[PDB]
Structure formats: C-alpha cells, structure tokens
Design a protein around this ligand. Structure first.
Ligand SMILES: CCCCCCCC/C=C\CCCCCCCC(=O)O[C@@H](CO)COP(=O)(O)OCCN
Length: 510
C-alpha cells in the first residue's frame, strides 16, 4: 500500500531494521543460511539510504538490536545460572547487553550517513567496509570486547571460505559488507552496474577455496580421544561430585590408554585445585606413561605468587608420555582472555556488593600471558585456547607457531545453554582451523565436541548432552597460510586505504 511513501516513514525503517537485523542470525551455525548474511547486510545499508545521521544511527541501532536481540539471546541462560538473580532482572541485562552491542552498529550507520550522505558506490563499497571494520573492531575491543555474530563466520562453508586462509575472517566481513552494499545500491537505484560488480567481487574468491595452504603428514597420524564427561553445571562445583567427576573421567580414560596417543578432557574437568589433586595427577601421569598415552586436561590452579598471594588461573595441564607432570612444569596453558562478569569484575571500580556477588564458584580468576608456548603431549605441539578464546582469531594466530600440529580448544558450553549458543561458538572455532590450516581438537563438557579438519570441515563429531568419548584418527598438517604469516595487518592496510580514500572524497564533496 504505497510503498514509495510508506518506506519514507522512520518508524517503518526501524521495524524493518529489526527484521533485517534478526535475519542475520539465520546465517550462523544452527541455521547455516549464509545468504541471510547478505540479506541482513543489505537491509543495514538500504534502510540507511537518504537518512539524517541521527535517523541513520537509530536505524543502525535497531538493526543491531534485531541481530543481537535474537542472536545472543542465549546469554539469558548464562545469566540465569549465574548469581541467581530474578527473572525480570535477567531479562533486563540481556536487553542491556543487546542494546550496548547495538551502539556500534548504530555508531557505524550514524558515521556512514554523516560523512557519505549520498547513495553512491563510494558509500557502500569503499566507506562502508572500512567503517564496518573499525566499528566491529571497537565492539570486540572496548570493555574486553565481545566480537560475536560476525558475518564472516557464516562463510565457513560458503563461497568465500577461501578468503579466510589468506586474509582472515575479518576480510570476509570486509567483502560481505562491500558486496551487500553494492546489491543494496543496485536495488534502491535500479542499476545493474553495481549488481555486476557485486557478483564479480563475490565470485572472484571462489577459486581460492581449492587452494591447500597445508600439507598432510600421514606418518604422524595418531588416534585422539576426547572425553565428553557431561557433568551437570549445577552439580559441577560440589564437594561430593568431586570424586564422581574424577571417577567418570578416569573410567572413560582407562580403556583409551595405549589405544589413543592423545587424550583430551574438557575445560576445568578436574574441578578441584591443582595443588589439591597432586596424588591423583601423579598416579594418573605414571599410568599414562606405562601404556604410552598422553592426557591434556583442564583444571583450576591457584598458584602461589612471589608476594605470598594466590593467582587463580583457568589452566590446561598435560600428563603422560611426552610430558611428565610436575606442579612447576611450564608445559601448561593459562587462560588469558577471561569472561567478563564470570571470571573477573570489569575494571574493579569499587567492587560493591550486589545480588550475584560472584555466586558461581571460581569467579575471580587471573590472566595468563597473551602469548604462551604450545602444549607438548607425546611429541605433539598443540596451540591451546580455552572456551571463549577460540573466537579471538588474532590471539590464536599470535599463539600459533609454524611447528604447531593441532589447534586445541577445551570449553564448557553449559553456560551457552541448550540452544543456538554452543553452535555459534562452535562455528567460530571451525574458522580457526580454516585460517591456520591446522586440525582443531575441540573437547567440551557437554557442548559440541568435534574434530575440525584443516579446511574447516567437521571431520568427526558426537552428539551434545551425552556422556560419550570421541575417538578418531587425526592427521597433523604443516605449512603456513598467508593469514598465519601476516595476520590482520594486510586487511588494516586495505581498511586504511579504503578509509583514507573515502574520507578524502567526503572532504572533497563538502
Ligand atoms: C555495558 C556493557 C555490558 C552491558 C550489560 C551486560 C549484561 C550481562 C553481561 C555479562 C554476564 C554474562 C556472564 C556469564 C558467565 C560465563 C562465564 C563462565 O562461567 O565460564 C565458564 C564456561 O566455561 C567457565 O567454565 P566452568 O569450569 O564452568 O567455570 C564455572 C565458573 N567459575
């Protein structure tokens, strides 16, 4: 009914911004509709056409609220099981988190329409990808960051997956924003010329998916076993369950010894402190060496500092053949990027008492080094990353080394819930394997335990929410991708070149 005048209304565009924003959630792992990434990003740039900077900022905020209000709505489950706050309060925090993350999308659309008001190819293909890179960086950097729901991860199986090993996932974000803008420009203004450019730019990286930046090593093939303990989150941290948790993991591991060269346990599989479990770990370490097996397990360690102080770390320790266990051994990985409000108090302003008050046990962890040596287990180099750290592509690459055999991640996705949460985390983990051309060994308490191939494919996987062991043969790969050699700087040079060119034209055109 008179769409020409109906679309001009600001309220109509705000309502459509929610719909197009929420459409981007369909691009990620539980749904895997990668065209929805383009459709969602076409609504972010078509609806902001011919708007005042404040009007465009509101449209960008509503688009972000639609994406984050439906994409990370699973945070309610994590908030529900943390602190035990009332239901209305938990709903408020999820809305507050979605509103906060939507500021960057609102900031992007406000600045984009402020400096490039005209609906031209410069705005959508040059200014938008460069400004999207900056605002997405800020979202993942400000206040410890939260770079969730980046559309580049939707192309893990799409035509643009070949661009990830060369320039990273953030380059797929750069190209998706460029292609979507040209399609939006070709649609709002009836003109096939930006349509052809978008299709050509989208089809150019397709042959890149057939390039193998790695070499398989069949001579070093091993049998890896990952024990999905499936320990309930409510009972995970209890004195009585400590014996049961150790018994469950040990009983599932004894048959694996000898048959499996590498055995992996999830994040914080041993819920007790590392110093409190020395007789158990020493006996376990000795038994593993007899049968020639190595165990890589997560554990909480409260290491006494020099100044008579305890620094609690979320650590991964290694036992068995190729890695003798000792409390002073450097063959360990301490988690560096702690989860905000779950492992530390942000900025520790006054630490005023509140309803949560760190209700969940072990909520005062410390930070490990940003760059740590790879774990060694039975002559195997593993680049470790605990849970959330696997989505930090640049941090994983910095810890990545040319002699790394596998990428290793252990997580406890019970906080993500029983919904799209664990899958979105799993999809971002698969990107690390694609970018670095290394097999990914992902072990979770009850989440998505899987082995990811060097090209991002799911080599093996087991169902969630069950007590099962994933035993499979995995082959290490060697060779450096262009992303592994360089990192994100070649994209930041491109962002600077596109940003500098676009800003110059903005200044030239008044
Ligand atoms: C203004 C900016 C912000 C706006 C408002 C934000 C509102 C909500 C924000 C944050 C709340 C989310 C907190 C979720 C906690 C998840 C962390 C966690 O418990 O992680 C576990 C997952 O693995 C660690 O493993 P575990 O062994 O199970 O440990 C048990 C814990 N000692």
């Amino acid at each position: 009914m008179a769409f020409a005048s109906l679309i001009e209304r600001q309220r109509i565009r705000l309502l459509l911004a929610l719909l197009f924003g929420a459409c981007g959630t369909l691009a990620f792992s539980p749904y895997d509709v990668w065209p929805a990434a383009i459709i969602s990003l076409m609504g972010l740039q078509a609806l902001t056409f011919n708007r005042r900077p404040l009007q465009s900022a509101a449209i960008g905020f509503c688009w972000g609220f639609g994406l984050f209000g439906s994409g990370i709505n699973w945070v309610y489950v994590s908030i529900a099981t943390f602190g035990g706050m009332p239901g209305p309060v938990n709903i408020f925090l999820v809305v507050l988190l979605a509103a906060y993350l939507s500021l960057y999308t609102g900031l992007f659309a406000g600045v984009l329409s402020r400096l490039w008001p005209k609906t031209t190819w410069l705005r959508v293909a040059i200014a938008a990808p460069a400004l999207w890179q900056v605002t997405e960086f800020l979202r993942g950097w400000v206040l410890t960051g939260f770079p969730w729901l980046q559309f580049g991860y939707s192309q893990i199986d799409g035509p643009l997956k070949g661009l990830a090993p060369i320039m990273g996932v953030e380059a797929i974000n750069f190209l998706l924003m460029m292609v979507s803008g040209l399609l939006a420009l070709a649609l709002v203004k009836r003109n096939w010329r930006p349509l052809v450019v978008a299709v050509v730019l989208f089809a150019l990286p397709f042959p890149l998916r057939y390039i193998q930046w790695f070499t398989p090593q069949p001579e070093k093939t091993i049998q890896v076993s990952m024990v999905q303990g499936d320990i309930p989150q409510s009972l995970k941290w209890d004195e009585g369950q400590l014996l049961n948790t150790l018994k469950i993991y040990y009983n599932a591991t004894a048959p694996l010894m000898g048959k499996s060269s590498l055995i992996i346990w999830p994040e914080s599989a041993i819920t007790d402190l590392e110093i409190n479990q020395q007789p158990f770990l020493k006996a376990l370490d000795g038994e593993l060496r007899d049968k020639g097996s190595s165990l890589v397990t997560g554990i909480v360690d409260a290491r006494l500092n020099k100044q008579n102080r305890y620094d609690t770390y979320n650590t991964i320790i290694t036992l068995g053949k190729g890695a003798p266990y000792s409390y002073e051994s450097a063959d360990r990985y301490n988690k560096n990027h702690l989860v905000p409000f779950g492992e530390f108090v942000p900025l520790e302003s006054i630490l005023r008492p509140l309803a949560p008050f760190f209700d969940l046990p072990m909520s005062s962890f410390s930070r490990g080094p940003y760059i740590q040596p790879p774990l060694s287990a039975n002559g195997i180099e593993l680049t470790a990353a605990i849970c959330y750290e696997i989505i930090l592509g640049e941090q994983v690459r910095d810890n990545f080394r040319p002699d790394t055999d596998y990428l290793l991640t252990i997580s406890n996705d019970a906080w993500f819930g029983k919904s799209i949460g664990p899958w979105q985390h799993f999809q971002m983990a698969r990107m690390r394997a694609l970018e670095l051309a290394r097999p990914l060994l992902r072990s979770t308490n009850n989440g998505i335990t899987a082995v990811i191939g060097p090209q991002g494919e799911i080599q093996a996987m087991i169902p969630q929410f069950t007590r099962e062991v994933l035993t499979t043969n995995v082959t290490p790969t060697t060779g450096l991708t262009p992303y592994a050699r360089t990192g994100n700087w070649p994209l930041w040079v491109l962002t600077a070149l596109f940003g500098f060119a676009a800003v110059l034209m903005s200044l030239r055109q008044r």
